[PDB]
Amino acid sequence: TNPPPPETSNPNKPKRQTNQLQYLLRVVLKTLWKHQFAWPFQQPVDAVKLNLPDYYKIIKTPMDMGTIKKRLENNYYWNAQECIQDFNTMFTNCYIYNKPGDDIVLMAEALEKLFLQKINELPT
Numbered sequence: 001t002n003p004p005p006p007e008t009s010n011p012n013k014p015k016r017q018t019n020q021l022q023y024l025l026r027v028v029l030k031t032l033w034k035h036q037f038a039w040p041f042q043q044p045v046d047a048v049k050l051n052l053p054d055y056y057k058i059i060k061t062p063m064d065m066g067t068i069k070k071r072l073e074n075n076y077y078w079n080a081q082e083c084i085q086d087f088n089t090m091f092t093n094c095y096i097y098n099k100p101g102d103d104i105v106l107m108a109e110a111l112e113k114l115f116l117q118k119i120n121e122l123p124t
């Protein structure tokens with residue numbers, strides 16, 4: 001089956017607004033969300049719907065842009081590096097589950113390239 005999604009809000013966690021977290025939501029996430037190849041990555045992988053029974057046998061740290069949006073907008077992250085780590089986890093999952101040169105791998109690679117260009121611009 002599917003696991004519950006990752007945790008996305010917790011009112012016991014301390015909250016802060018930073019320039020870098022603001023950029024990651026308002027600029028980074030937005031540009032990725034509207035990319036041609038964003039659609040597979042906008043919500044948790046639904047392994048039941050897609051008939052991928054081994055997806056969560058292989059991928060033990062799930063992540064998707066939907067979850068990352070929820071974490072940014074709920075002030076779940078304290079450090080910008082947490083969010084960057086989550087985007088990395090998302091791309092890496094796709095590379096782990098799939099194989100070099102698969103269509104979805106090319107799409108993730110191109111998304112990652114745009115994420116890297118956008119992070120280059122992260123404000124201080």
Ligand SMILES: Cc1nnc2n1-c1ccc(-c3ccc(N)nc3)cc1N(c1ccc(Cl)cc1)C[C@H]2C
Nearest residue numbers: 039040041045046050052093094097098103104107
């Ligand atoms: C992300 C990711 N990492 N691996 C996968 N995915 C993936 C997630 C969601 C979908 C998907 C597929 C159909 C649909 N209606 N909504 C979402 C397809 C995927 N996959 C996918 C998406 C696009 C293309 Cl062209 C091929 C495979 C394959 C699947 C194993």
